[model samples]
Target chain A: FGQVVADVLCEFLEVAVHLILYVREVYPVGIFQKRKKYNVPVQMSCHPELNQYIQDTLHCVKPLLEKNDVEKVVVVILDKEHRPVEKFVFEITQPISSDSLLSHVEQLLAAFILKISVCDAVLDHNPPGCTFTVLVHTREAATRNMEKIQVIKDFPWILADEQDVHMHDPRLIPLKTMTSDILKMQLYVEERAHKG
Target chain B: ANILKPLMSPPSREEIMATLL
Candidate 1:
């Protein structure tokens, strides 16, 4: 029972990219194409340390794939309505199992939702595709960390990202551009849950 | 092009090429 739960969570985590695309409302590709299309195939990047963990997990299955011992991974993309966009399969060498991967997915999803709330505010004030301000630290801390942090707001934290564009505009870029020490960018939104 | 999967029991690169041709 415990292993099953862990497996599901890990599987979700391994495929966290789907969740990110879902939040940005770009998961199902063309479904959102009417609204937005992921400019590129949704890509999953992780903090280096975490990325190594995934590699380590997948590499352990060597003998199973055949002394060829290949590792197979599948990414099934779905639209906001949860319809399929495209499915891809890759055979590689790695160690992570479906369960371990999904567990991390759960953690990332929880964090992504909170991120969406902050981003939504920025999106409201800024523009759908332009830069916006999100609360990075709690609303209370913004008072004290106003100068150090990007924006002073009431939310617990503020982080921002470009909706469909990646160019830099100084004013809007300050809040949405990558932070020097941040681990990774995770996006989440309301409506339907679509993962990368 | 209509690419049919090769029919060899243990499909090899040569068999795949033949199918493609």
Candidate 2:
């Protein structure tokens, strides 16, 4: 069913968020350590607060994900002035399952993680002291007030200001795309702050 | 390095360690 598909997609987002921060230099390198996920080597954060923020953000996102209400999720890196200089965009669309496609999903996960690991080569170096936040873009219709929302209760949610999430003709770097009978997603990065 | 190949090739631990983030 869709349960398995949602499960894999959510899992991918979690690890990918950690790897994005690691490759983008959002924190000190010493805070990250080598780990294996999806049978491939990857980096994960050991910083407690950063880990919590990402986890909680995902926690709130899971419900929307299962309902296929989410449009895309962005891990945005903000410069000293709180403007986004780079974005790790994971654009996912909902799809359902079968056993054969389930097996194929496994390989896609590994390939996706490996691709993210080397993305640093194609990206601009994020500025020092950059901070990051996770933005969950729900489908246009689901953007209602979450105060009345179920299960995802008591968590603070905010509408990302225009400047926080918008990029003006930014550079785009394609990372991974997974498509099949049971899943569909296009992962890419957006870069701003110029280079010559 | 060719974008496709290096991207497809898993770097040694040292290479990942030294990558300029």
Candidate 3:
């Protein structure tokens, strides 16, 4: 109904293009592969963009995690040989409506963790100092799966409980936050950078 | 008048470049 200026129209068009590009930068396209075989695996290397992708994805999912909504998030730091040297978990108690899409459940217990597909090595190699994989699950569910992991609902302050089984803390090191996909710890191949 | 004539008009680099410019 109203007349628009030519320059204003052009400016709007440019903004749209930039916005699309920005989205691509944020949720950039990633390639995934399941045929992962650790050749020369290393631990705790700063994998740059790949590490950033893991961190960014974790932060993005924060708003979705409410108090007690999630059970816990486990981060495993693996050595170059693909062996886990260090692992830690952060726990939340709030019941979640969405986290992981559970395809199966052990016993009558309901394991709730957001299900997200992985794109491992899609952007970069695992950090050299700490190559990591994240596993998130609830207290009840985790116990059935791995009885050894020490669970901590209250983190940072208390590293280990009297039992000392489910122990985890961040003062020692940083952790990788995982996505909402539950069953699939899917690994995506690297298209931008592959250090293998 | 075949409608395919208009559809079959191959887009040339010049035409695309002119539009882009």
Candidate 4:
């Protein structure tokens, strides 16, 4: 991670934190509210636990991002049986800096939220009782010394179970890959395909 | 938890696909 877009990157991620739930129907629609963040009213969660979870996640990724110590981040959606149904893969192509001005940042990142809003139509619906988690892939050297340093004591980094991490015969759907002075972000969905 | 007003129905698959194309 590097410092260029640490704050803004986390801000963009939080929108994704709640947006997925609304698009996937993880909870009853009304459970979420139209919260304003990036100059738009995105479907955001009001549940304290959910909000705290989002905070917990961003806190974990924040410093790593600042130091440019992360490789990629994935938002995994799971079935009740703990099987991965979909993975929203976010990869950074280039490090950020010089991407400034509040207005430019908003317009650049807001495109993600808007594209995500309609993604459900392009994918198969997950089973009922689906849940999700955020996974951060640290840079090679960053993970070599895994616990050599403290990112945040309260932030516990756990290895995700293989069942939920591996996708079998998955179909990949490309969302939007945008390159801006602010960030070079590529987002796509990995959906597990039904097999005989 | 705060509640949001109901969302409009999702767009039809064909429509979304067309836009992507």
Candidate 5:
């Protein structure tokens, strides 16, 4: 039950992330192909480099989720100058599940993905030449010693004060929430102040 | 007799594609 639920959650995160990225036009639409996932149409990147990056990030996040060490996952979109113009925050809360019911898990995941697609119609801002980064926040216990934490080599770290766009007041758009017997997730879209 | 019908009509494929690209 534990393994199965963990796997479902992991798949859900990956699918959700990709769909959000596509809907937000974070990548060239040509690079994504449409398919049916969770019984609804979903777009996934087929570009090798992009696909590998998603897979690697998911691999890093899987273990943290399994250990219940993750707090939230964020996708921040930045302009050419690397100024964050938008952010998608997925708040993951307790009641973390390992339920083995495949049908139940599928329904929950499908609803979440559908919301991502629907909300894109509501948001009208999309900055050209924008890029994005995926960030995962972990529980305090998971990062007791910042220096002791293991991260991918060559990954750049930015101090909160060093970010310009991070300070921008974002227009928050709350999306739908989905829950299973084990966990609850709420998604929000935050657009750059100037764009709002 | 209605001025709003066209405005209410769904966007065409080309229109959507133009916005997407």
Candidate 6:
């Protein structure tokens, strides 16, 4: 059970990294190979640096997920001026656990991968020079505790007035909802045309 | 202990793919 839970947690992050890179076109589509997981065809980026980045980010998130301290995981695309142009929000609605979580999360993540593969066709692409940041929203107490960890440098956590980074005239599109006995996550994409 | 009862109808991989098509 312990191993299964750990595997699910890691697989969840792996899928998210690939899906975001595909949706944002962070790398050329030619570099991604079509792979089958959860009985669904998903594209995974073959770039070495991108793969390393995903692994490192997943390592940081694993502890937070195990502690059930995460509220949401967002991948925000910022325009050249550092203003948010697009955001992929994965809002967690339930706590993480090991009880029957393996199968439930497997189905959930599989459906999400399938959803992104199809929806990428209709969504607006990010413009040139746009960059992205992965934000993990944790409880205030968890965020406070993280500050004491000396090895967690370059974390880039900020004290924002609001939770989500707002966009002007933002439009939201419902993506997919994945639920297991131990976890529930609703994925949405919020974006708008860049305003100078 | 479903926190979100109605909002959490997670679809299967096939169901999601079928809906897309």
Cα lDDT tens digits, model 1, A145-171, are: 323322222212222223211222212
- Could you give the DockQ of candidate 4? 0.02
TM-score of each: 0.21, 0.82, 0.26, 0.80, 0.76, 0.73
Worst 10 residues of 5 chain A by lDDT: A153-162
Looking at model 6, give its docking quality level: incorrect
Off by over 4 Å in 1: A1-95, A122-124, A127-168, A171-196, B1-21
lDDT of each: 0.28, 0.68, 0.27, 0.67, 0.64, 0.61
Candidate 2 or 5, higher TM-score? 2
Q: For each candidate, give the TM-score of chain B.
A: 0.28, 0.29, 0.29, 0.27, 0.32, 0.26
C-alpha positional error of residue A80 in candidate 4 after TM-score superposition, expressed in Å: 1.3
Candidate achieving the largest lDDT: 2
Ranking according to lDDT, highest score first: 2, 4, 5, 6, 1, 3
TM-score between model 4 and native = 0.80
TM-score, predicted candidate 6 vs. hidden true structure: 0.73
| DockQ category of candidate 1 | incorrect
Proportion of the native interface contacts kept in model 3: 0.00
Off by over 4 Å in 6: A1-7, A96-101, A147-164, A193-196, B1-21
Q: Could you tell me how far off, in angstroms, the CA of residue A150 lies in candidate 1 after the best superposition?
A: 40
* CAPRI grade, predicted model 4: incorrect
The regions of model 4 sitting more than 4 angstroms off are A1-4, A96-102, A141-145, A148-150, B1-21
Candidate 2 DockQ vs. native: 0.03
True contact recovery of candidate 4: 0.00
Per-candidate RMSD, Å: 20.7, 9.2, 23.7, 10.2, 11.5, 10.4
